[PDB]
């Protein structure tokens, strides 16, 4: 009249049928609940890549015009 509550009997038979299920492996996992000042114009560190090879290997000698920044970055 108060019969039989609580068992983990059958509960792993019943949970291994459609199996025990890894989530799946993504190349693009979400950026949400992530540090928003890390993200909010690193949105614009992407949007500042108007070009990346034509006008950009111009820059390797455009800053080697001033011989780079080879010394003073060492602090």
């Amino acid at each position: 009249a108060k019969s039989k509550n609580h068992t983990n009997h059958n509960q792993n038979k019943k949970a291994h049928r459609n199996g025990i299920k890894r989530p799946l492996r993504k190349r693009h996992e979400s950026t949400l609940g992530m540090d928003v000042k890390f993200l909010i114009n690193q949105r614009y560190a992407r949007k500042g890549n108007l070009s990346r090879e034509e006008s950009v290997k111009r820059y390797n000698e455009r800053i080697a015009s001033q011989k780079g920044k080879p010394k003073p970055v060492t602090l």
Binding site: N12, A15, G33, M34, D35
Partner: protein
């Protein structure tokens, strides 16, 4: 009929070790945690802020986030029977670096050092791990003090 609530059963989980009490050593805050790094969770009982709840102690995740004091780690919990990947904001004192993969990464460092000087020989580069093969044929010499040296099965009487 409890688990319920939040630090229950963690009398031995968030205990300290024996004579490892007191002040936290200072390199615990000097470790660098970049996004996508494998990271174990073993919680610190002497830091009562940012402790993970007890399911995640002993587990292993990857750092998905860095903020000023903590790392978001993405950890797998089996909630039966299926695996959700849980996002747990956990402070830095409760978080360690996994050694598991930096002795895989010292084999990528040798699957290119040994394939480098194999441009001269050619083969076998032998870039796969082999399980423990059965042994060989080998000539055990005695000489060594010739045998017998003979056991017999006897220890009871007392």
């Amino acid at each position: 009929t409890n688990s319920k609530g939040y630090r229950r059963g963690t009398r031995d989980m968030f205990s300290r070790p024996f004579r490892k009490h007191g002040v936290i050593p200072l390199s615990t805050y000097m470790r660098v945690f970049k996004i996508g790094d494998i990271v174990d969770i073993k919680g610190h009982g002497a830091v009562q802020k940012g402790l993970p709840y007890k399911a995640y102690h002993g587990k292993t995740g990857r750092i998905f986030n860095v903020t000023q004091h903590a790392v978001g780690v993405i950890v797998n919990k089996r909630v039966r029977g299926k695996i959700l990947a849980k996002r747990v904001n956990v402070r830095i004192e409760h978080i360690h670096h996994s050694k598991c993969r930096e002795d895989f990464l010292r084999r990528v460092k040798e699957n290119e050092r040994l394939l480098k000087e194999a441009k001269e020989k050619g083969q076998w580069v032998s870039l796969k791990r082999q399980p423990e093969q059965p042994k060989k044929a080998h000539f055990v010499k005695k000489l060594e003090e010739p045998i017998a040296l003979a056991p017999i099965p006897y220890e009871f009487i007392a």
